[PDB]
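Hi Q.,

Before the meeting this afternoon, I wanted you to have the potassium ion prediction in hand. No need to reply - just skim if you have a minute. The sequence and ligand are here:
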Amino acid sequence: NATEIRASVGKMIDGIGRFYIQMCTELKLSDYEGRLIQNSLTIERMVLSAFDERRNKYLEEHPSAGKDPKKTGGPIYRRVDGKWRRELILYDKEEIRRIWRQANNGDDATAGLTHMMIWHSNLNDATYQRTRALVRTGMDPRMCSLMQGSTLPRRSGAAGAAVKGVGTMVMELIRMIKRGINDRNFWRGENGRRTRIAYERMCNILKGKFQTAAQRTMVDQVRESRNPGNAEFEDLIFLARSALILRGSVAHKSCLPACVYGSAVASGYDFEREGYSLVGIDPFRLLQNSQVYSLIRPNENPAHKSQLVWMACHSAAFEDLRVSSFIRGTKVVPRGKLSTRGVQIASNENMETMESSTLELRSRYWAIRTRIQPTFSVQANLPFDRPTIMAAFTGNTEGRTSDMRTEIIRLMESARPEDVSFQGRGVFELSDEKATSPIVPSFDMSNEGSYFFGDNAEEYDN
Ligand SMILES: [K+]
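Predicted structure with the ligand bound:
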């Protein structure tokens, strides 16, 4: 089966690569410019757009370049006369779709679109705080670590779901409910058994991430409300709190930008023939041989920009910094400590003071995602820091109450020498491709374990 799965995924990767190579030819990019990560973004967003049908399935459109709905594109950056120059290209969505399909042996390769969509999601996860979204949902900002895939477009399911975290689901459910509290037949008619079927589906997706019968059970109690309101809200928030301790099973998917794949395909790599898996050496191998540049703002530290992108590539934001640091071979610091802002350049920034720099995306070691395999690894889910504890164990002194609420607290209060939902990394030498010798990591215990400690990133909604 993996016999043909590695092929199937490989096949996808070829397609993104070929697509990218061709888009580079189209736009007449210099080798450097094609390796410019902000150009990679614009090109990815382009193809995503061309297939979105304005559904917000694959992306959210600004619309900072597209009033004419038949057309799509964004800022492309070229090096001219010792200056970085930004131009907005517009293309026919039809034309893009053409090129995309052509790069995919004539297929629709929806998996490729999704792969790019997740890469963006991962990049946003590494970059932007969601503190504001959480309060407006009545959640606790210390739940920031449950907010995987929080930034995925409002329509997706096929593969979108697996990467969303427990908080993201709670937030999405709460948002629905909250709007059944300004009613207007939100729950009656065609519409309100339409949404009622959505709501059901979501609760199930939620339920699935949960890894104890107590919490799943409690989820069912919420699903099978009927006019959902403040009652369920409370239970959900209760549920999110429990997810800080009895954590959910959430897929972390390591998806690289299109330029990396493009470059590998131009280097004659045959992904379909060789196979591809997101879960082990494959993305590490690619990143070791890659050459990606980035635009850089004055007073930003190239190394920090580098961290930001590495993290995103390896989908590592909600993972223990100490593990990341160990695999990278240089300290992976919390976002608050990072002398950089996001990879994308707001259209009002700038170009006069802009520079480019080389991204450092290598790693000292490589790793297999465990419990996806299960040898000797170490927990790569976040540590129990004070603030996680404090947010996990509150308003139960209060209000609502149940046998489901009492179990759960019970499980929480006693929560193991090891811990439920084991997201791992097994770590190997790059000189040990076949994985013959697990390295037992030695963490530096003085490092902060949470990407989100002292966070100060721009808030995502802006
Ligand atoms: K910062």
